[PDB]
Structure formats: structure tokens, C-alpha cells
Amino acid sequence: PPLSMDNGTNALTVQNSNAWVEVSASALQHNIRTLQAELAGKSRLCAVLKADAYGHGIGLVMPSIIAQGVPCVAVASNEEARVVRASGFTGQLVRVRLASLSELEDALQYDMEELVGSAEFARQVDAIAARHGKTLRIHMALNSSGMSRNGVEMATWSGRGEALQITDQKHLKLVALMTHFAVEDKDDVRKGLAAFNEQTDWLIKHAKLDRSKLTLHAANSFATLEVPEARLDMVRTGGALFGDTVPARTEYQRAMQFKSHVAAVHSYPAGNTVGYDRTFTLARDSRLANITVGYSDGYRRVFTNKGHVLINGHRIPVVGKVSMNTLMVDVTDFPDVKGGNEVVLFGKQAGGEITQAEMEEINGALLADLYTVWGSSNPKILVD
Amino acid sequence: PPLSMDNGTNALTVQNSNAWVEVSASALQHNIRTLQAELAGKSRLCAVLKADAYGHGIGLVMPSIIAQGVPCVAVASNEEARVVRASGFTGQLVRVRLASLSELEDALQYDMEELVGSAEFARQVDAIAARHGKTLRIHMALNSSGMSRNGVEMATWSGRGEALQITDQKHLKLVALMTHFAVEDKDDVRKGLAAFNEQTDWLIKHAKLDRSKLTLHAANSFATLEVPEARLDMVRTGGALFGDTVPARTEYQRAMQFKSHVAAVHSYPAGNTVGYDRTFTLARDSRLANITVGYSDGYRRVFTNKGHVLINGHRIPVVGKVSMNTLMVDVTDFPDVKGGNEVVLFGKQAGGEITQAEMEEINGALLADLYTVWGSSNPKILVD
Ligand SMILES: Cc1ncc(COP(=O)(O)O)c(CN[C@@H](CCCCN)C(=O)O)c1O
Ligand SMILES: Cc1ncc(COP(=O)(O)O)c(CN[C@@H](CCCCN)C(=O)O)c1O
């Protein structure tokens, strides 16, 4: 959780960092490159890079997005925008959530295209562009797939009207329409798509604006890889980039490993308890590892008496409550674990693996919900 | 999360922050002044400032610590220490968890007193001081309340022996004995104190130790407040400083509020469902507020269709799965809610209140499990 950053770059080493997150530079390029070919010049790529690149370091990943000349980049937070631009990405850059107004105003300087899903929203945002002399480009979000989140519900006549006035805006230039698929099911994406289609068609036709000057973009990762017809003009892909997408497509390589150190290993007696509130009772006569990681560090409380790490290839049980900065793990079966070893909180360790599958199960929600904040709470460090 | 930062300083402002953590400098400055009094100058005070000050900004909490002549600070990570010193705090600086050697070593530059819990750990560490020409000051950790965590187990001769060789180390000034308590409970905390006493007595004796050179220091916050006799030479408080301690002690004030904005408000019709996986169906023609905060932001997935947030003092419910960046709430009952409105996700807003108790409920862990990380994934902004 570095306390000094210069556009995503810290001064930290693996040596002097307590727990760290390893972005694989290589897996990255292999993922970009693979998508780029699978897509096949039938579609463009926005690399979906919000959440600081899903906890991978927008600043760390920007090199490689530039490297594989990816044309487009989605962000969410204003900083993500500053950093992309400050990397020299002279390309298309779009926000993939609604902003707040003040926020959006600041953003103006970064020349980002802004998402709009409502006429009242549109209206204000317009007066903000007028105010600065600038012309602001906008993606119109359409609730085609049923998210009820960013975009206008073009299902009812009200929406269709709201949609019109979004385009009546004299200081906003319209340049896309979009929806985002809501269920990761083939059939359900397929309806979403059929809807997005009529609604685009409808709005294009009836607001006498023209195809040629818009990009229509609905496909997320799962959508791109599974319902390719849903590709259309451009796709925005987070997960797949980083190798958590459809578990079956194993050509998409994990980009992020989460790791800590072993502080030291202590002995304890039969009948001791471990961590707050005496949750675990020591069954035999034990050796424990003080691992320099906690919930402060990201490794959440919910892993209490449930989770496992890897050390020296060894699958090793988390024991007792997870303290704020220190994790306790039973090495009582593994005499070969020693001070300064390397803990793998998530990933593979020559032999072993902590599965995304098994961590999600413990957590109660998807893995992003953990790793996008592991990102925030530790140093991201480039590798391969 | 600011992507550029200096010692925990950022050019981020409530205007362009998408969500953010407000640290109340009076809530702080009060809380310290309160302890310092309640203590009566009869017992020394460490500001336990770990996890970047329990997610409050450590480089933020510092200038007040310095100005109130708090003599000691307790940090966890190396950066935390760098920043304490960067800030001009000059006095006693201990680490409250075993470090791993590489990390311990890097830290030598900051003059920190290091926690030590076993003979082997000690000798190793002796080695490093040795190599460096330094005399490292060490706090011995006892397992008196039986956390089984950093503390040498003194309930067993072998362990007892370990203690003794920890003290036989040539290159380490042993300068405290401490332990930490496992149950926030008047009785269990007492047993542990009584234990800790005989063990400190014993060590001082058998190791032939100048009592006037040791700090005997055991009490956390709860212990300090609820069990005076455990104050001994010094205490170690975080929660209290931040107003997250014994709910009953209301003289200690919350120093943190969690906050975000309304993106805009969309009319979605009955029958629509909200967010990934159709988790929620609209029983009525709704007005849904789009909030520029999400699980990547720290506001985690556990709150799907569970949470409440305040706008204009209104208890408004989370609807649909908390997405990565945006959060959807139901303002159909609350037409005062417009775009741009400030949102409390945790705290108080004119007359309403999002209680620690009600969030812990849904989380399943103490509030620190959430908010130490809110700290990390959001900019912290000083107030009052
Ligand atoms: C509007 C939008 N466009 C593109 C993407 C990229 O999708 P992908 O990562 O699934 O390829 C997202 C992901 N944001 C999701 C994360 C979905 C979790 C799956 N990785 C959210 O808001 O929760 C998105 O919200
Ligand atoms: C060794 C030690 N000493 C003192 C404290 C300060 O406790 P206080 O916050 O009650 O003043 C801690 C905090 N670490 C704990 C406390 C949780 C914070 C909730 N109060 C942990 O690792 O969960 C600690 O690990």
C-alpha cells in the first residue's frame, strides 16, 4: 500500500514490501495479442482498464497497450484518465460509467469521451461544455440488455423521446451508442443483442443521424469470446486481458499473482488458541507461520479458518481470525517452511495452486471484488 | 485512489474524487486530547497508526500527533515508518508486528524498534544489526493472552528458554516487554494481565534486567479504557484515536466518513431488473440513483440488495449487485434527490445515520475489515 506514487510508479522492491501483487507484463501482451487475432480485423479493441486496470496498475499496463498499438481505452476514474494521457496515449479514451458533473468538468482537460444515459444528465453536461468553449464527445448508453444502470430504457416510448433530446444537444457531439450485457449466458446476451440492434436502428433512423459517424459497442469479455456476432464495431474487454474470463478459455493467461513473506515461524503447545476471540484450538502441538499480511493488506477477514496459502509448494491452512496486518498459518506438517520464504496468497507456486474458483467460493462474491482492492492496497510489481 | 501521491498527499478534491474518505482533524485532535487526559500523565501513549492510520491517512494523522507531544507511534509497514519520519516525528517508533528480515533490514534507516517473538528470529536479526554496525532496539513479544501470533510462549520451559536467549543477543538493546490481548472482555483481559505480570517479573529476574530501562506495555484501546490497571508503563491505542472503540464510550468521536456523488437519476419502468444477474425486480415504476462508487472503490459486493446509503438525509436502499464502479439505489420515494448530491455510504447526514453496527451486520466482520481498505482505494481528505 505504497505511500508515494508517481503516476502508478513506486520505489518499492519485493524485499522491502510486506505483501505484493505481481502483474505479469508477459501474460498481458499474450492476452492483448490473442484477442487482437481472435477479433481478426472485424472489430476494434478498447482495453477496459478501470479500477486501475483491475488492480494491475493502469500506469504499469499502459506501456503494453501502447506497444500492441491498441486503438482504444476505457476508464472510470478521472485519475485513470490523467495517467493514460500522461503516458502519451494519443488515442480514443472513453468513460464506461456515468460521471458526476464536477468530476466530468475536471475531466475535460483530458479530452475523454463521456458516457450519457438521460436527457436531464445530457442537458447539464451540455451547459458544462458550452461553458468551456469545448465540444464534448459522448457515448449514449442504452439499457438494451436490462442493466438499469447507465443507459436510457429505449424499451418504452419515454426513453425513445429522452433518447432524441440527448442528440438535440448543441455542445455535445454524438459518436457512439452502447449497452452492456447483464447475464453471462449465451441466450440472454443474444436477446440483449437483438434489442440493442433494433434500438440502435430505430434511433439512427428516426433521429436522422448516420451510421458512418458512430461506433456501436456492446461486447464485454464473455460476450466477445462466446457470442461473436455481438462484436459489431468495437469491444471493450477487461477480464480477458488479465486472464480471468470464461474459465474454459484457458488460452487467456492470468496476469496477477498475490504474494506475501513469512516473517518467522514460532512453536506453540497443544491447547493454545490462535488470534482474536480464541477461534482455533490447537489440536496437537504446533508450528505456526507469522505471515506479514492482513485484512488491512487486502487479504480479507472472511478467510478466517477457511483459506489456504502456498509456501514451498505446500498447501497450508489459514488458522484463527485474520489479524489486521498479520496472517497465521499452520506449518506444523511442513518442517521445511522457514523465515523469509514466499507465500502465495493467490495463484500457482511450482506445484500448487490456489484457485480463483476456491477463493470466490470462500468470499461469497466474484474474484474482482477481492483483487481490484488487493491492487489498491499493495505494490503492483512488473514481472516477465 | 490517487495514482500520483507524495507521502500521503494528493491534489484530489471532493469535486473530482468519485468517492472519498473524509478524516475529521478535530475528531482526531479531540480524541488524542481526551486519551492524554483520561490517562492522567501516569502512563505513556503510542498512537497505533498502522494500516496507514487505520485507513485515516498516516501522513494526515501525524501533524496532530507531533503537536500534542504524543511520545510514541506504532506502525506496521515500512512505508508507514518512512512517512512518520518524513513528517518530522522524532520520538519512539516501534513496529507492532514481526517483520520479515528483508523488510526489517530495509527499515534500519528509519530507526525503528522491532518486534521479536522467538530465539531464532532474534539471532537472525542480531545478525543484521551486526552486519550494519547498529544496535537495534527490540520489543520482546510475550504470548501472555495467548494470541499465538508474535509472542514467545512462556507457558513452556523450552519457550521460556527462548526468551532468555532473545536477551543474550549481543547486538540488540532489549527495551520493552509486551503482549496483546485476545478478548475484548474485562475478565479475560485480566487473566492475561495477571499472566503477563508473573512472566515480566520472571524475565526481569532470571535475565537480570534493569526495570528502569524496560517499558512494560500491554493494553490496546479496549484494555486501556475498560481495565486501567493494565495501563502499566505505556499503552497502544488505535480505535480510540479514531473513535472506533467501545461503543459505550461516546466521548470518542468518529474521525472518518465515507462519501460519494449522484451521477444522475434514471426512470426505469416496472418489470425491469437491476444489475448483473437480474438480482432485483422493480415492483413499481422507479427513479433510480446512479452512484459513482462501487466494489472496486471499497464498497464491496456483500452489500448487494442489503445496504442503505444516505442522500439529503434519506435512508435509501442499494439495489442490484454492487457493480465495480457504479452503485444503484432506489430514490422513487425521494424526489429531492438530484444529480450532484453528496452521498454518505458510511457515517451521518443531516439527521440520518449509517451505523457501524448495521454495516458489520452485513459484512460479517469488524468495520475495520472494510474501512482500512476504503482508506486505500479512495483519496483521504482532511476536514475541520
Ligand atoms: C461498461 C463496461 N464495459 C466493459 C467492461 C469489461 O467487462 P469484462 O471485464 O467482463 O470483460 C465492464 C466491466 N465491469 C464489470 C466487471 C464484471 C466482472 C467480470 N470481469 C462491473 O462493473 O462489475 C463494464 O462495466
Ligand atoms: C500488537 C497491537 N497492539 C495494539 C493494537 C491497537 O488496538 P486498538 O485498535 O484496540 O487500540 C493492535 C491493533 N491490531 C488489531 C486491532 C483491531 C482494531 C480494532 N480496534 C488487529 O490486528 O485486528 C495491535 O496489533
Author numbering:
A (entry chain A), B (entry chain B): 26 to 409
What does the study report here?
In addition to Alrs, a PLP-dependent racemase is found to possess a broad amino-acid specificity (broad specificity amino acid racemase, Bar, E.C. 5.1.1.10). Notably, Lyr is also active against arginine, whereas Bar racemizes arginine, lysine, methionine, serine, cysteine, leucine, and histidine, a useful feature for biotechnological applications. To further develop lyr- or bar-based marker genes with desired properties, we determined the three-dimensional structures of P. putida DSM84 Bar and P. mirabilis Lyr, which are the first structures for lysine-preferred racemases. All structures contain PLP, which confirms their PLP-dependent nature, and the positions of their catalytic lysines and tyrosines are similar to those in Alr structures.
The final Bar-L-lysine structure had R values of 17.5% (Rfree = 21.9%). The apo and liganded Bar structures share the same two-domain architecture and are both composed of the AB-type dimer. Superposition of the apo- and complex-form reveals a RMSD of 0.34 Å for the Cα atoms, demonstrating an overall identical conformation. Moreover, the carboxylate group of L-lysine is situated at a position, allowing hydrogen-bonding interactions with both catalytic bases, respectively. In conclusion, the determined structures of apo and L-Lys-liganded Bar present the internal and external aldimine linkages, respectively, as well as the anchored substrate in Bar.
